[PDB]
Amino acid sequence: ASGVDDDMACHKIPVEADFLYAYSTAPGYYSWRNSKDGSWFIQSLCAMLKQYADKLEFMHILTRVNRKVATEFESFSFDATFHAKKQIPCIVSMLTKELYFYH
Template structure:
């Protein structure tokens, strides 16, 4: 599957692609949970159990996560830089997209051939139901 993806990407000329499969990912059924964060008129609101979580993984599933011995991990370096630069003006997913771009620009430099000239891309999994802005 990975080799096919690389070949397909070369054919696309490096163009981004979005895929949205509609398929079950398990057998659990979500009964939801009640929240009291609604308005006064609706004191309780039922939301999905997994709603309003965001996972920011340093790398895609199955891949190595790189770090610089002096500066730290590529992901945390990039996350801190992008938060410092954009936290007061951009929505969180916009910031994380910039983190992805920054990490993708890095390339490993190692004396070990198997570890030399390698890349990394973070994996952002969002179940957010609304935009998230940091307080000013």
């Protein structure tokens, strides 16, 4: 097969390629932080990195972070409007390869 948009002689990659955005919350949502212990997302991210950075690929580590935040945390507020709320981190990957912090 042949076409007008593939197999260029000069190899190029998108200027937006190889970026990874690890968002603490879903698009359009508030993000929660415990005034004493820190944000749910960063707390969880550090915990998962400390436990799995030498064992799992980065996306899988972030998936564990997603699960930790989603299941273990629920807001507490004297304002009923902000009480008992949940949060799900959001992994946005434009990476082109697997990423392991070890080799």
